[PDB]
């Protein structure tokens, strides 16, 4: 067979959350939680810990790697020698490097041949999950849950955040979910069975 | 989009202003009844409020959803509000002032640059009238536009503690307020007020005209007076309990005289100078609208 | 003690799909 | 009429470059020229026979009813050139005017109903706008680089390797190029399904179908506001550092007069036994030898290049001494939003802000002081005044999702805190073709 | 809203002693916020009250 | 003892405690209770907890906290006392007087 | 030369009472409270054009002195200190200023100190050549005589 | 000289130069004005600078 795709598990995104904390802020009342709910919700509550001053959404540098020639330390993609003067050295920190970076971003996405396979997964016994998380959960989920703000609901010590997120999530127009969702391709075969998460 | 009732948004049960009285719900009007005053040798006189500058802050677009209601109510009533004179919120407010803006004011009190069909919002003409005046709250810090922090409080006193004859006369004795009270009566009152959806009140104050407006001024005088009361506790030079029989009477000396006190104290919420600039500017705009 | 600041981004955990020999279904 | 409303039109080069070949392969008559003696019914016949709202302008003065017909039906007239456009129409309303136009992109998808020959959108054009104009040699350098990143041997690509002439280098530029049969004369023949294979009907930018599918997602990524963190221009002004938010741009005060920077404005002049860097002031023409006492001025600097060190230092001194507001539009920079505890690791003199090469990316830092706790009641009073000069001209923190994740007073929300957008949290569902969707809002 | 306790990260403090006459010039001025003070030895509140 | 409810193996105790606790006239609680002094400041924020403690000590602790909360001494008091004990027309330039 | 006070100014007698520490914006500040209006200006940059007379200086906080001098620099205050006594010298331009007097001492010295101010007489300063390019900075004089 | 424009500190010179370049009758330019590819090889040959 040709290797037309690159089978993977627990995929990288193109965008990731990045967070700057002020370490001096810290809620005094420690929040005990169910060990199961802590393992679903927990990467999130760490990333958006109390005292996080800023939470940006950057390009995922782990995905848009330096193997593609893309630095991302300045917060925008930059590529060394694509759009360049001819007959001289390019010069450091050129702004053209931004345009080049977008191109390579656009290139790397145009050639993303990744194909997800389900990774290690869990079927928490439900009575072991707090109801807010039990609603969001759909039978099963990857142990690498990733991070979504919707998970902070009734977990963040920060009151207004929980009130706002609760407000949004309670509205009909938005509906968080996690794990194995029923889909139109359910039961379709292709050596193995397609499913939606 | 919520249609605005001929009597204003404040007519709606959705926008009722109420305060706990030792924990039980009560209209502000039935709290103001508890208040009683002792006149002193000094005398408040309300010289005319300087007219507000025409200059609205520039309508720069800003990331995110500004929470303007919470901003104003915290700047006026909340405990130790911060960043009250930060410019972004009022810049979005001035964006609401524009004749055909995309921005919208939710009944929630947030501003959304999106048309946002899912969330109900005030009629844009009304918030145009309202933002056209209250965006000026962004001028509160700039030296050219700072409001008289001292004289305006005379009006506050007159509109709160003033007897109908004194309110006609425009001159009243400086007063010492007092009322039967509970453990943290002023703080709890400021909590009860900071939760008020005041934008209904302000939007109605600016949008309505003629008989509906004057009827709004009579129907809501007690509300305005309660906001005035919370500010007065914030600026009162001195506040103390007096143990009369088994009852404890809170005593605020003196109503209508801004002491410019900024250090925190147990009895009441406290204004930093930025809160004074803000509150004074707010009083300039509100008293100007109230007297027309 | 002096007040300080810190940072965190979410980590990649992408791996090549595991080869299992066991099967879920008849 | 609204800005979207009006009489649409485009340059002939845009027509030729894009819509015309699609007209060819779709097997339609070439859309009729409008003499201006032309009937609206004829234009209707053409839009009918060509399945696009397009007609080519021929010769002067389109008649009223036909013009209004183009207006109601949003027909896209193809003007050979934009000079004196209004003279080509007979406006009874006399409200048509040059400079009254609104320029904008128009996706080919919005005119062609034939989806098969549409692989892109506004996005790619918007990207190309960012690109420097490229000599063909630079295009080859770019292609050789993309090849280098992807480990292909691009040697002898685009080249002739003749035994006696040596190696020779043809241009690699070939935008919108198609595969087309030629006459023996060398001229191109219009595509014919009767002889040429179906694969040649439209070279789909020469990309595999999957690459187009993914290309669409990537263009949606590139043009997203959150990615767009290369910022333009900075306002220099001498305020106290009071506004916590990084995205703050001081508003210009009511008395200030806007002034374009020009070399002409500054000069040497005698003044009290020395040669001052005088600023003559265009509204009134008064010369101002001293940096202090100058009229309030919102000066705008489009291009720093060629500006003297003396003039620059004098503009800065005028910001400080005369409260000048100096926008500098030529700065491209990449802002980093610091938290108060990390301070300012990277610093910037006014001199460098004035004298940095035009093409280089600056890297400014901006505090978000939202999370700075109140001073103790007994901390000594500060007689000094912290001051600031550099501000962004546009919102920074386009990337921001959340902010101030602490409690103000246990229950209350801090001013300037931001909750995540609802969309971050809306796992929707899939559309019947398999695209991602948000949840339905309300019903149905 | 709480008063800080851990020592905070203050902006750098430039002292400009101001003489009877001096040549002010603003080459190499800082653009970042920076507190400016006229006097030295401004830590004058030494009488601490228990 | 209210904590023994549905925990003590002893049946009648649980029936009796359940009976008392179910009556409207008695109502156990534990931890952070909302109170009239909630949000009141005094350097830090006062709050109420439902402690397991004798009502005597609870009454004394309450009384002490309220004394502190009503004392309302400020820097002005210290600079007045300081002024009494200092040479006449000495000046004090401390913090905000309040 | 004795610079005239500009027409928009307001005379203000100094008293310790006008200045006080005050919370402003997450910082304590040497606030000034202008007697004509009563308004407190936390910061030196925004203050009304004040012509402040100081008869005393005794008992004055050093912090308040720095705040006032900053108000000169930032709000263009004119600040007439009447307590100071000084000898003067009138240096020729060739001679230059052999020595200088800090505002820190003019504002915080015992009342009996004899200051020695120097004042250049610039009648004979050479003119620059017509073609010589400008130099950058401005010369400044912060401290002026009240009398000839 | 045309290069001095908006680079010379000398004002009158920059004014006179800008004045000449902003006339319709004169226009400075520096670089590759012209190109001439071969008819068969399609490579460039005679370029005017």
Numbering used by the authors:
A (entry chain C): 150 to 346
B (entry chain E): 1 to 292
C (entry chain C): 74 to 99
D (entry chain C): 841 to 1284
E (entry chain C): 100 to 149
F (entry chain C): 298 to 395
G (entry chain B): 1088 to 1235
H (entry chain B): 298 to 346
Task: Quote the authors verbatim.
In contrast to that of S-CPV, the cryoEM image of t-CPV shows string-like densities emanating from the viral particles, which we attribute to newly synthesized mRNA molecules in the process of release from the actively transcribing virions. In t-CPV and SGA-CPV, two SAM molecules bind to the MT-1 and MT-2 domains, one Mg2+-GTP to the GTase site and one ATP to the putative ATPase site. All domains of TP undergo global outwards movements (∼9 Å), while only the MT-1 domain and the large sub-domain of GTase domain of TP exhibit local conformation changes. CSP-A not only rotates outwards (up to 9 Å) around a pivot point near the twofold axis (global domain movements indicated by dashed ellipses in Figure 3D and Video 5), but it also changes conformation in its apical domain (dotted ellipse in Figure 3D). CSP-B also undergoes similar but less obvious changes than CSP-A. These structural changes in CSP molecules result in an enlarged, yet stable capsid of the transcribing CPV. The density of the unexpected ligand is as strong as that of the GTP bound to the GTase site and the surrounding amino acid residues, and it fits very well with the atomic model of an ATP molecule, suggesting that the large sub-domain of GTase domain of TP could also be a viral ATP-binding site. Compared to that of G-CPV, the opening (or ‘gate’) leading to the GTase site and coupled to the putative mRNA releasing hole is widened from 13 to 15 Å in t-CPV, likely to accommodate nascent mRNA.
To reveal the mechanisms of transcriptional regulation of viruses within the Reoviridae family, we determined the cryoEM structures of six CPV/ligand complexes in the presence of magnesium ion: CPV+SAM (i.e., ‘S-CPV’), CPV+SAM+4 nucleoside triphosphates (NTPs) (i.e., transcribing, or ‘t-CPV’), CPV+SAM+GTP+ATP (i.e., ‘SGA-CPV’), CPV+SAM +GTP (i.e., ‘SG-CPV’), CPV+GTP (i.e., ‘G-CPV’), and CPV+ATP (i.e., ‘A-CPV’) at resolutions ranging from 2.9 to 3.1 Å. Like the atomic model of unliganded CPV, the atomic models of these liganded CPV all contain two conformers of the capsid shell proteins (CSP-A and CSP-B), two conformers of the large protrusion proteins (LPP-3 and LPP-5), and one conformer of TP in each asymmetrical unit.
